[PDB]
Each structure stands twice: as C-alpha cells, then as structure tokens.
C-alpha cells in the first residue's frame, strides 16, 4: 500500500509499505530515501506517537493514511 509521511517543513514523503511493516522498518525506509537518521525521527499518527516495535496494522494505519514526522532537535 501507499502511505504519506508529512514533515512540519513542507515535505510530503510517499512510501510504499505493507500492513505488516513495523515502525522501525518505516523509519529505515524514510532514511533510505530522505537521509534522516531513524534515531532522530518521531513518527506520529493522528496525534499518537508510534513505537518502533509495533506495526502499521497495530496502529490501524491503512492505505492512503497520513503520518507526521517530527525531527528530534539535537539541542532540545
């Protein structure tokens, strides 16, 4: 399926994932095409922070769903 990951910096990232893909896998995919280290990625869905261990299915993230990516500030 195709999901969208929007940053708070005007960027829309279109990802090709599967319901079974874990949040860890998704962050890795983001680094692959965007260059953002997983450790600095805060993924959010409908206001809920996502855990690397859970899957997209677990958070009920389906096709055409939109997630938000908030970068961790290196100096707070």
């Amino acid at each position: 399926m195709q999901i969208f990951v929007k940053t708070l910096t005007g960027k829309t990232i279109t990802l090709e994932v599967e319901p079974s893909d874990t949040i860890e896998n998704v962050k890795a995919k983001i680094q692959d095409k965007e260059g953002i280290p997983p450790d600095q990625q805060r993924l959010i869905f409908a206001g809920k922070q996502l855990e690397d261990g859970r899957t997209l299915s677990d958070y009920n993230i389906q096709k055409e769903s939109t997630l938000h990516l908030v970068l961790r500030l290196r100096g707070g």
Partner: protein, 98 residues
Amino acid sequence: GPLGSEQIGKLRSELEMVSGNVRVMSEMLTELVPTQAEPADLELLQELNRTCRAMQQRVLELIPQIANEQLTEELLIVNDNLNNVFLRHERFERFRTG
C-alpha cells in the same frame, strides 16, 4: 503584492506548513491525557506552541497587508484555529497542574 493574488503560489506553501503544525498540535492535545502525558510529550507540545506562536504573529502581520477579501478571511480563520489550539493547550496545562 498588495492584492495577495500576486504571490498566492508562495503563500499557499507557507499556509500548508502552518496548517500542518496546527494539526499535529491539535491532534496531540486530543490524544494525550493531561495527567498522564510523559515529559517527552510535553516537550513536543511546547515545541509546537513556540512554532505556532511565531506563525500567529506572521499571520497577524499578513492580514492587513493583503487587500483580497477572501484571502484575508482565510488568514483570519487560520488565526482563529491558532487561538483555539492555544486555549486548548492552556486548558490541558491547567488540568495537568494544580
């Protein structure tokens, strides 16, 4: 431009970014429980507040500079939405504290 339509392309991209910030903040406030929110969650809410605060000043600055009435009303609505999420955050904090 004085009308607002001259640089509408540029303005639309700016507004999308502003709306994105408001949406994340609004949706977090709805998902989070005041007395249960972790320090990490509270940190993010404050980051969003800071960003939205500066964006509000910018929206308030744009409003009188734009002649177009539809665009001016759109900005006023965006401003209303900023105030709404700010008040919710204030309420969220009152609940979390005291």
